Design a protein around this ligand. Structure first.
Ligand SMILES: *[C@@H]1O[C@H](CO)[C@@H](O)[C@H](O)[C@H]1NC(C)=O
Ligand SMILES: *[C@@H]1O[C@H](CO)[C@@H](O)[C@H](O)[C@H]1NC(C)=O
Ligand SMILES: *[C@@H]1O[C@H](CO)[C@@H](O)[C@H](O)[C@H]1NC(C)=O
Ligand SMILES: *[C@@H]1O[C@H](CO)[C@@H](O)[C@H](O)[C@H]1NC(C)=O
Ligand SMILES: *[C@@H]1O[C@H](CO)[C@@H](O)[C@H](O)[C@H]1NC(C)=O
Ligand SMILES: *[C@@H]1O[C@H](CO)[C@@H](O)[C@H](O)[C@H]1NC(C)=O
Lengths: 100, 100, 100, 100, 100, 100
């Protein structure tokens, strides 16, 4: 079974401030999302994330991650993640899931 | 059946101006492509797009999309998509296709 | 069989200078990596690369590739690839592999 | 996609006399059936036949075939086949179908 | 996931008498077995039964079934089934299971 | 990958006498065959045997096996197997093979 989707994170004004887990990064923000598979798997599927949209301010550095936290049989937690003085106007992450 | 490929869009001087479908975007351009599968599927495969190359002018904002329009059993329409005063010297999109 | 992973290339000070294979590019650098599949395939799997992290200096152009050189049944060679006066502080490439 | 089923041919009084295609066999009879897959394939599936029931007269020889004539993407023609003075009171053929 | 196996029912002296569920059959006996998959499925697999061994008394009729009662994700109930004055010295049933 | 086939053993006059491996059986004969897959597997496929043809003398007992000896990635050894005073005029074994 193979399922796909898209996560439009949008502007980072709507993102939440989260506490840094990398000592070299501060002001870490993130639009986290809990995606739920249409047809649940039984064993957690292999998931790939892909950044398919980007709108980032040119005066400051491009700092972006498409972070994949975890994958259960039922869904997964992933996020658009930026930090420092980066400004993200728009970030979308397409994803895919395959059983095994 | 799993098939893969790469779409080298190149410079955006060669891209076509297309009419905006987002009210907040103007001067929308796009290198659209109609990809045809080597071995045709019968049911449309799940397709994932991935931006694997980028060459973008630093003086203006990074505005890029890897837009996936549609997927038939026989192929798919996707594009490199930029807008406003963004300059893209180079954009390649790797893709993958899986039956179900 | 489906396998996944992540290649953290990091800062490009640690990358090697490699000779250009594109006449229009100079000062080409690259963090090449030889990934080996946990469970070896017998026929080379289809592999997709995806840039899931980016930290790039804003004063100079964003020049990055997620280059996929080759794929054997046993593994694959891929790299984070930049050139000219681009500065990459961070680049991670998530990948996926599927038999056929 | 994998589909299964069962073909209860029953008594051979209800079977049709068909013309022999083997010179050494006469009085060839056969309960032919045209099975149609619930979910049609696109490429013809590999089909296996299996005799899972038998009720045959002991005074004469056991002559039975589970003959698989053809396989389209949409279904298949198979039959319970006996000949000479064999008497079949009952013959069921379970089958399986797999894409490829 | 595909799993296989074999059910040696042996002599029908060791089989249990079970009550007939077909009005035209009496003295119905059966060696029922509850098979459990090594690697459990999550959705019940499609199962095919196949009689791969037979030792039957020639003075009386060949009456045998390879009956497939049910299939759960975890296993299945099947049996060697005979009736009337048939004598089975030996009956083995090979089986196969496939997810979907 | 799924492959199928048929093994027509024919008359048991052409079968070889082989030494018994069951103490209760004598005069054991067998038409052994070494089948080779058209498209070789890499891991040995799961193989199911099925008797789809039978022509057996009624005056003596039906003693038949569809014996599956071994399965390599490249093929398999199986046989039509009878013993004692059983006479087999005809025995065909259909088979199927699936990767995993
Ligand atoms: C989904 O995400 C939210 C937000 O972080 C979290 O609180 C919740 O526990 C997640 N769901 C699961 C399955 O844990
Ligand atoms: C492929 O793309 C072109 C350009 O947009 C379009 O005109 C054509 O209709 C497309 N093909 C299909 C299958 O519609
Ligand atoms: C893996 O990468 C290294 C570095 O480029 C290379 O020398 C080596 O030959 C590669 N391994 C294989 C399988 O060729
Ligand atoms: C199905 O079987 C019948 C009976 O032999 C035959 O006439 C018919 O043509 C078959 N259908 C197809 C698909 O040809
Ligand atoms: C397995 O078979 C036995 C014997 O008929 C039966 O009692 C038991 O309930 C079966 N197990 C399941 C899963 O029901
Ligand atoms: C195939 O069968 C023959 C006859 O028994 C045997 O001699 C031969 O060794 C077999 N081939 C393999 C792969 O061992």
């Amino acid at each position: 079974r193979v399922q796909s989707g898209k996560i439009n994170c949008g502007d980072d004004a709507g993102w939440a401030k989260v506490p840094s887990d990398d000592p070299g990064r501060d002001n870490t923000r993130e639009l986290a999302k809990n995606i739920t598979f249409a047809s649940p798997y039984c064993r957690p599927p292999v998931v790939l994330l892909s950044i398919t949209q980007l709108d980032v301010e040119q005066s400051q550095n491009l700092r972006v991650i498409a972070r994949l936290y975890s994958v259960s049989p039922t869904g997964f937690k992933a996020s658009c993640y930026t930090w420092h003085n980066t400004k993200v106007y728009s970030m979308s992450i397409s994803w895919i899931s395959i059983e095994n």
